[PDB]
From a paper:
The lysine 26 mutant is the most important to study structurally because Lys-26 is conserved in all shell proteins and contributes significantly to the interface between 2-fold related hexamers in the native crystals. Two crystal forms were obtained for this mutant using commercially available screens. This results in the imperfect tiling of PduA molecules seen in the crystals and apparent lack of tiling at all in the bacterial cytoplasm.
The 1,2-propanediol-utilizing microcompartment is assembled from seven different types of shell proteins, one of which is PduA. It is one of the more abundant components of the shell and intriguingly can form nanotubule-like structures when expressed on its own in the cytoplasm of Escherichia coli. The majority of shell proteins consist of a single BMC domain (Pfam 00936) in each subunit and assemble into hexamers.
Residue numbers in the entry:
A (entry chain D), B (entry chain B), C (entry chain F), D (entry chain C), E (entry chain A), F (entry chain E): 4 to 89
Write the structure that this text describes.
């Protein structure tokens, strides 16, 4: 099941993008990851359609609050990637 | 209950925002987070009114001391958001 | 009791603040906190008069060494803020 | 065996690179390394042909998400270097 | 018990400063501290005259190799400052 | 014995420096250090000639992959300096 990622500079922008991503026809919040330098990545999992819609809504929400750095969907992620997710 | 956040660049400004918010209204200080690049977010919970007054006061007190980067209120935060809060 | 904070760019200016502050007066050096972007916050506790004199003395001294980003005293922080302080 | 590294600005680009790499060939995902200013290095091991396939796949995928900082393959790292690798 | 500090951006410049300061009557190398962001402070202890000379020589040598951010001596450090040294 | 360091901005350029260094001369790779802001130091030990050959070769290989921030040799490091090396 697909993975939506929204990365911001700023935690308030990340919390808002998360809030905005989980209403959703089945996407749950996995968590966020800090890599230092003010950069926060929020990660959701769900079916590709709601995930695509959810990550778009996250980026638009976060953009109101802060700086959005990356927006991305991985529709069919490999098993091995799991081991690098929060 | 509602969620409030004030994100500052600087820890001194954040501690002032925190102290100003809890004296301004019936909110509870949930905690603060650091994400690097000098970014510190303080987070409060309470009803939507008290969180709105608390953030405005916390922003205003922080601005007297340091840089405020974001002020935001989530009036009805989704259950999944509990996951990623201090 | 009272809270004093001198925030500097770089560790050398923070060591200088700390030394000036604990020399100053009857106050306890708690330590310092890193928040990224080279910022270091020095934290002391003591009676309000000493913490006032000490943060004055710390800021003055740090300024001779490098950049002082913030200086603040909170005479009587709220109990919930105490929970989040270093 | 060979060593493959793709280095990106940000975690969202690094996760894309990582997914693309393990998906594209018979390589083992080691993990990733944070080094500050937002830079993340993804590291993979496998035979030289697959590592060349995977680092190519990884870097082209990541360019669509964010900035790629380095792309490199070491067919046969020295023993002393094996010692210091993730 | 005087304290010499040289703060560099970059570890090579710091190692070079350390090696140039200790060649010196009695000044001993205390250690170095990283605060993130590329910033390293080298700290020496010894008598005031030899520490002033050591830190001037260390800053000169470090500037040959990298960027020097602060240079400072505290002639008579308070005993509580030891708490925040590496 | 002599001391060689190459400091890169980027982990990928540092691994390349380390590999090129030990394939260049009779050096031991002591290890690498991270200090934030993308800066990685690779350190080698050996007689002065080899350490000079190695750092030149490590620098030259890293530059084909990323930025080199510093290249330095200490031919006769003070014994005090061994305490701060990895």
């Amino acid at each position: 099941e697909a993975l939506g990622m929204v990365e911001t500079k700023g935690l308030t922008a990340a919390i808002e993008a998360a809030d905005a991503m989980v209403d959703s026809a089945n996407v749950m919040l996995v968590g966020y990851e800090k890599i230092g330098s003010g950069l926060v990545t929020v990660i959701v999992r769900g079916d590709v359609g709601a995930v695509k819609a959810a990550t778009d809504a996250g980026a638009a929400a976060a953009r109101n609050v802060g700086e959005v750095k990356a927006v991305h969907v991985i529709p069919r992620p490999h098993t091995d990637v799991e081991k690098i997710l929060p």
